Design a protein around this ligand. Structure first.
Ligand code: CL
Ligand code: FE2
Ligand code: FE2
Ligand code: FE2
Ligand code: FE2
Lengths: 291, 288
């Protein structure tokens, strides 16, 4: 049985991503959020509800990535250096999820917080969205998986990392780009810096597996991938309508979702399939290069 | 579908262990090991070989805990705060494994290192002991697991964290307690501080699952746990004889193995099964 041996490179990129994930390490204890209350109380009721709801959705996604997506992909990898990187990325998803709780504690009462998590648990679109992604993960709960099954779990992971979070990230960035809730915005920028490299890394791994598939299996997962992209898009468009109609931002968020969908595809070595709001860009400017 | 909500405690201990695991965070670049070369070259070849072999074994166990043990146990937990802690602990196993490679790079040539890892991969006792533990983990590769299956994976994990590492930790601590390889010994001490809390935590989880079993299932896993403990002990005694006979330390490391087996039992809420003895005072000085 093999032990991980970092003296013998297993690929040309795992050490670089190991080192970068470590260099980027942070915890919620490092950004105090209390100074955001001065601008939080200046938001309308409808704006505050949208903010809390999107943070709830982001928490759900990070919960499933750290608790299912990273663990189940990594258990089936044969490359032990890449496995190490994914284990670390999975832990950072739990840091991210804890960081949303840190923001909530500063901005909401204990009663309001528990209402938000109850709304998350019973929300039909979030359930559908998370269910579609985790289905591909839970296919890997068996002793032996095919490369097609592993490839599609990696696709699902890239689409969560590079695409599904962004209908939620939009709003903290949009407010931060206006000088509102800028400490929470700093946290969301740290999260985005991590998710960006998670999506690139899993995409590299996916491209390596794809090259190992037969031509028949390549064409099958190419079709499944495009269908998944558009199945998620349909749900995201319904989600943006629900969250953002009250505050007038639906079409802006949809453009941002398409931008990031295109990035997810590029992380998989795939051509864009769709066509950034400048205020969002200013909110990233504290990432700005990446976008 | 539920998101982790740290505002609402799921249990009385996960936040405490989350905070401590974070507080203890460290990485491989924080301890330079090059100053150990002055004492490394004073060791005989037999002493050097034993050191490299036990580090190889430790690396194997950490590879399996980060890549199978923590991920598969955590996937099946319902407690999302406990899941978080286990994910972090799994990442720290990978930090531990990376740190062993750092030690190797300072103390061995590239050809020597690859020889060690080929020795690990083809070693029959390491393959056997890792296989016994990972068999419990790989039973969890199915959509739904029973609580009996989850419990026995947690037992295996506590036995790895609190017991199977220590036939290997012995020698770095023994040398560090003599002023030899003391920078490598500081790394090993950081790893031990982590494994100690990993074993306590998984043991708490195991005790929670045990209480949720029927009497019939309790009787089954109680017996399996005791058999597993002694099945692993028989393998560890062959392993210590293989590694340490050349350097005169077999009975010393066997005493340390039994000490730590007892701690693994206590982490599971179980009584000690081996004669209770004070720790070797040289090893104790290496832990200081
Ligand atoms: Cl295959
Ligand atoms: Fe995340
Ligand atoms: Fe991520
Ligand atoms: Fe470890
Ligand atoms: Fe551990």
């Amino acid at each position: 049985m093999r032990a991980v041996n970092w003296n013998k490179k297993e690929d040309d990129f795992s050490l670089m991503f190991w080192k970068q994930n470590i260099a980027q390490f942070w915890t919620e204890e490092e950004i105090a959020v209390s100074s955001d209350k001065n601008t939080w109380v200046q938001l309308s009721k409808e704006e505050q509800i949208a903010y809390k709801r999107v943070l709830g959705g982001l928490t759900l996604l990070d919960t499933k990535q750290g608790g299912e997506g990273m663990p189940l992909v990594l258990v089936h990898l044969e490359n032990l250096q890449a496995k190490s990187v994914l284990a670390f990325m999975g832990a950072m998803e739990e840091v991210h999820a804890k960081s949303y709780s840190h923001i909530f504690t500063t901005l909401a009462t204990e009663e309001e917080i528990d209402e938000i998590f109850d709304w998350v648990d019973t929300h039909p679109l979030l359930e559908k969205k998370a269910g579609i992604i985790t289905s591909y993960y839970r296919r890997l709960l068996k002793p032996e998986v095919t490369k097609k099954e592993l490839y599609m779990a990696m696709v699902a992971s890239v689409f969560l990392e590079s695409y599904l979070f962004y209908s939620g990230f939009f709003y903290p960035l949009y407010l931060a780009g206006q000088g509102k809730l800028t400490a929470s915005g700093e946290i969301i920028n740290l999260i985005i810096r991590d998710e960006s490299i998670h999506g690139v890394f899993v995409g590299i791994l996916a491209q390596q597996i794809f090259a190992e598939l037969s031509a028949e299996d390549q064409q099958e997962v190419q079709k499944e991938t495009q269908e998944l992209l558009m199945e998620l898009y349909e749900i995201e468009m319904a989600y943006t309508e629900e969250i953002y109609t009250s505050i007038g931002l639906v079409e802006d968020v949809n453009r941002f979702v398409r931008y990031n969908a295109n990035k997810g595809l590029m992380n998989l070595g795939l051509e864009p399939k769709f066509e950034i709001n400048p205020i969002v860009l200013n909110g990233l400017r504290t990432n700005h290069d990446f976008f």
